[PDB]
Assembly symmetry: D3
Homo-oligomer: 236 residues x 6
């Protein structure tokens, strides 16, 4: 439930603020003063994507309209907090992905642009896409397709092309590019783990549960449950 | 030509603001309220490079002085919008590169630093270079020589060394380093460099050559050739 | 000495402000108005990590708390300045690393998180760790151990894991990752641009890792590892 | 009625933005991009009351909650634009009071604090009262009762005590104090108070009375009368 | 000359910065890095009138266009710095009125709105008029007529009506209102000194070199060289 | 005691933050995260006097320099808090003056300028004097002498001249001017709203000045002066 992840987050925030006086204001502003995940998420995103030309107050108006028109966007977020939570040894707090992980922020921001790109509000989608790249150093074309339970660990330098597909429970590290030389982008299936720096190019298939070596340059489809590594990548 | 690009850009901004109420203010303050490309660009770049210590208002004075001093800088920008637009079917509006692409922004901010360095105003050149690296995550030394018709698509992690040169119509993708092992690469016109490529040393990359993603280029590459691999060999 | 490096910085800032009118304000605010490196460094760092939710005035309180508690943090900063200075003919001024190099800023910022982490103030360490990623495009777990004379040249995309150890005088370029399949990089080493060093493995003193290498096996002292996967070359 | 005022306001903003390129962004972000009076007002008031500690984004949440909770607040605002517009020939646009008059802003910010005080959220009421005093230089205690059709022309230095009441269609000018020597004034409808006037004590100021500039009112004033002087006598 | 007042100001700034390290940045930003009075004045005004909706960068664009279209506006400023300079015992520095006096800033800002009101750019004039009131607590209707050598000492609460006239070398203190009950506003002649809190109402004449008591309520014309005081004011 | 008033403030802030979710952040930033009144006061003041040219982080350095040099400045602040508290049934919390009353902020800000003025750092005193006018609509020359237990209620439009002297426990309302045709206001006095006291003249202990009065002649102890011009009434 969005309300159960939200419950853990609220309870954690209360504690964390009691233990860290220098951060209490922060916990109250992002979480404790909000009523639900969307309120906290939109407050967080408006502030992070904010700039001199489009202030946090104006960015938030945009994000809230999107959450109001399609509430499931928020649900995708709760599913994303959960995934990083146990697909990451160290992340034990539910509030950690929500508050600090730029890959998480990048994905949730992207979901906003995707909804917008589907409403044919492309100028708005392109504006956000690029502010997402400036703030988080993640560039996902609004038209790309991405499922839930997604993890962009560290995230710096991740580039996802216009025709890319990313299924559920995929994990992507820093420096990964999904791109090409119509469909000229990868179709990364369920559960795939992509190592740091890997460049996946072409309308090729990366089968469910496959693993990609760090720095690979994958050009040929990768079988399900297989490991692809090397430049160019071979099944290993 | 500036006037045509600018006019196309202006006509676009009008229709776009008309169709997207939420961005109307953005279109008006970045483009519509300005009279020429120079004013729109210096407005955007100052705001994107601004920080608490050097606010947009103060950085705009620097940018303006450079534009008033060397007007051809704005030209190179006009040529870059042109390239990006055509050389990337995806981009289908004159105003997109101006408004949204950080690679484009980083190059134009760079042309400003290059001028400052050529005028012996290095502390200013250095400050900007690094603010450019913070904003757009593109680090181009000010003494690097770069032509026009340049495309830094995505751009994250690009690093260009001090003695590098980049001729016209070159396209560079994310994570590309032009650096050392004169100690940096010389990229001739029409070269396409793939994502992640590391090109090391004062070596020649011939015109219209293609560099594969993640390659590590150590020896010269032949014009029209294709280099891929770690080390890069010809394929 | 922190007082030595500081004197050099003040002499330079005074002339730099003299020669560039449009930047004099900047030199006075970061350097000349302060009385020591700690004051300049905390001001610079608070301002760069600042955001709408936690402004510079608030972040500085945190950094100053740390510097007051452990003054040696500032000493490591003075040591890292020389390194980027001597280890790089491309940088000649003492104040250049302090003022403009994001890799340097990311390292000094990390040192603050590392101290907090060790005081068990982990939420503050995590908050900063991630603001460091946003501001400088560098992600170093506060638990990582990093000695001094460190140089993060260009820095973009550098990622260092929770159990990584980086000894003295190491240099690390853009796109470098130290983590798991975390690394132990001995003194004087380095990790060339785009290289990924993965696994509980050791990189010997003065070894060299080649651009875009993928290191999975230990690397010998003074050895040059390169390739995907890395091979002694 | 809100819908007519709002629609008039919107039609005005369109033409104005059309005629003044430099303010087009302002008109779009304050009015044009919003769907109702509530959104435009909460946007303006949050931005005008914002400070480094409580940014516009955070103050807007408070304002929104109050508007969603007690919708009639926005109404009183609509009635105040109406008054000002007509009761001051100088003002000749529905949008001017909304956009430019700080007296109008201070009253609407006040209605928010009054609601918060009535909901026993005093620390919030107190915070705003004082931020209102900083922004607009108008200090209205939150427990003061104020009707609609109110005009605070110029408004600088206005101070309204805790037990004050102000009925409909009252106009108050700069430097006016409604305070003590229940300990504050009761201003009936239609009263016009001149600049600098100090009205002290729980005394009645009858409907449609006129108070001269710089007067000091200590005894009750008769309806339709005119009080002027220090002390004020009837003239 | 605008260039001589500017010369004193520049030289003073250089010294003042050398003597006050904690303010050096300020002296460099407002004065020393600028080439002329207009550059320094517009930088100062854009920053002071700035707000979340219209940032200093955008306000400055407006002010610079005005100075470019009518450079004499700047000259009026130099004449104003001079007047406060010796019509005020304590003010010995030329840079003091320029940098710190809100009445001075208020007047110079007003001159911008007056030029704009004459170009029929009323929405812009009204916007500035009111931001001037918010920042400096001075409200001068753009249509009012005001000469040079003007001093708004302290300035808080000064209100100047739409049809008011203020001639050269007039001095006005805090709390002064020029207003009314067509011409329904005062015509304050050359050299008049108006005490704090005085309310001058009606299309009445205040003769050159007259003096107005603090807190007066002037309703009848005041003779040249005379003193008016009281509520209502009498010639005394 | 500053420690007494501080304890009261912390107890209140803790409950206030408890009862109002939308303001908890504010209470933690101004009060709870700090360890004493000086920390809270400088944070509050730096933030209110901040502007694009001199941000809060920069103004705080100046205030802290002053508080470090003359800790007693903070003691006068604690004393002024009680005054607004006891001298006003409309204010009941110790933290209300510290948090929300601009007259109080203007007074404490002035004290900083007064100290600088006396250290001969007049440009800094003048800069602040005028930022105080912009932020709080109060203009007090740094050279003015003002004792403690001072209450500037509502404050708007208050103007105090260079040679003015205000002793202890005085209360001054909005629109008040102390200057020349500067005043000497003895202990416990006051100056009602809109009153203008002009000339090198004396206002006696516990005297009362009526709203909009124009005082030109000395006023006797316990006397009530009112009128334009003021007359003993
Ligand atoms: C490929 C990977 C996923 C492990 O998968 P695996 O199925 O266990 O593969 P193995 O370890 O069995 O090794 C099989 C072959 O792959 C090679 N190999 C492993 N990783 C490689 C890489 N990144 N590039 C190229 N070759 C690689 C091995 O040397 C081995 O070769 P061999 O058959 O000649 O002996 C892993 O090595 C990797 O690259 N992980 C990236 C994780 C990462 O980026 N972490 C950073 C954390 S911040
Ligand atoms: C090299 C490249 C430019 C295509 O060039 P090309 O002229 O078509 O050369 P080819 O595609 O015919 O490839 C020839 C050989 O190189 C190999 N190769 C291709 N790209 C390679 C790369 N990046 N690294 C290593 N080998 C590569 C192929 O497997 C092929 O092998 P073969 O010997 O069996 O014939 C391209 O594949 C590439 O690397 N593009 C990067 C673009 C990018 O980064 N896009 C991201 C967009 S966000
Ligand atoms: C490791 C390094 C620092 C110096 O290496 P070295 O000890 O001098 O080794 P050499 O230069 O003699 O090269 C030896 C072999 O390595 C190969 N090699 C070198 N760098 C390589 C790389 N990155 N990937 C793959 N092979 C590489 C050479 O082709 C040579 O091949 P050989 O066995 O056929 O003789 C350097 O080669 C390198 O990669 N530097 C990157 C620095 C960088 O990132 N700069 C960016 C500045 S922004
Ligand atoms: C009193 C006032 C409202 C007019 O009311 P009115 O009904 O016309 O009363 P009158 O004008 O006939 O004045 C009658 C007497 O009051 C006196 N008077 C008028 N205004 C006075 C004032 N503010 N204080 C003292 N006496 C005043 C007149 O001199 C006149 O004297 P008389 O006995 O010789 O006949 C008006 O003069 C006034 O004070 N207006 C203030 C408006 C203001 O502040 N405007 C600023 C706009 S920014
Ligand atoms: C009126 C003023 C300008 C002096 O002018 P002046 O021509 O010298 O007038 P005089 O002092 O000779 O006094 C003449 C009469 O005016 C009266 N008077 C003076 N100031 C008065 C005032 N503000 N209100 C009413 N009556 C006043 C005197 O009591 C005297 O009356 P008398 O003939 O019955 O004895 C002066 O008193 C004043 O009000 N100055 C204001 C300056 C100010 O606001 N300073 C604040 C600095 S921040
Ligand atoms: C002075 C003051 C504090 C108390 O005065 P007091 O000692 O009780 O004097 P009194 O109330 O007995 O009044 C005595 C005479 O003064 C007159 N008077 C009082 N205040 C006056 C004023 N401001 N102007 C002119 N005359 C005044 C009375 O009408 C009375 O006249 P009388 O001689 O015919 O008997 C008070 O009258 C006053 O003006 N307070 C203003 C407080 C304020 O500004 N509050 C605003 C809260 S935001």
């Amino acid at each position: 439930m969005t309300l159960d992840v939200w419950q853990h987050i609220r309870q954690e925030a209360k504690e964390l603020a009691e233990n860290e006086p220098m951060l209490a204001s922060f916990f109250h502003s992002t979480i404790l003063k909000h009523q639900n995940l969307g309120g906290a998420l939109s407050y967080l995103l408006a502030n992070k994507l904010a700039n001199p030309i489009m202030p946090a107050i104006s960015l938030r108006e945009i994000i809230e309209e999107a959450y109001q028109s399609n509430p499931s966007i928020i649900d995708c977020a709760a599913c994303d907090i959960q995934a990083v939570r146990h697909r990451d040894p160290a992340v034990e707090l539910w509030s950690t992905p929500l508050l600090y992980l730029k890959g998480f922020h990048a994905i949730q921001s992207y979901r906003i642009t995707h909804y917008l790109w589907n409403q044919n509000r492309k100028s708005l989608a392109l504006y956000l896409q690029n502010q997402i790249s400036v703030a988080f150093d993640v560039d996902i074309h609004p038209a790309a397709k991405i499922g839930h339970g997604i993890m962009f660990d560290h995230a710096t330098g991740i580039v996802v092309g216009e025709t890319s597909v990313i299924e559920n429970d995929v994990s992507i590290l820093q420096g990964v590019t999904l791109g090409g030389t119509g469909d000229r982008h990868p179709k990364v299936r369920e559960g795939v783990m992509i190592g740091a720096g890997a460049k996946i190019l072409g309308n090729i298939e990366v089968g469910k549960y496959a693993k990609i070596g760090a720095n690979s340059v994958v050009l040929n489809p990768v079988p399900e449950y297989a490991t692809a590594a090397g430049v160019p990548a071979r099944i290993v």
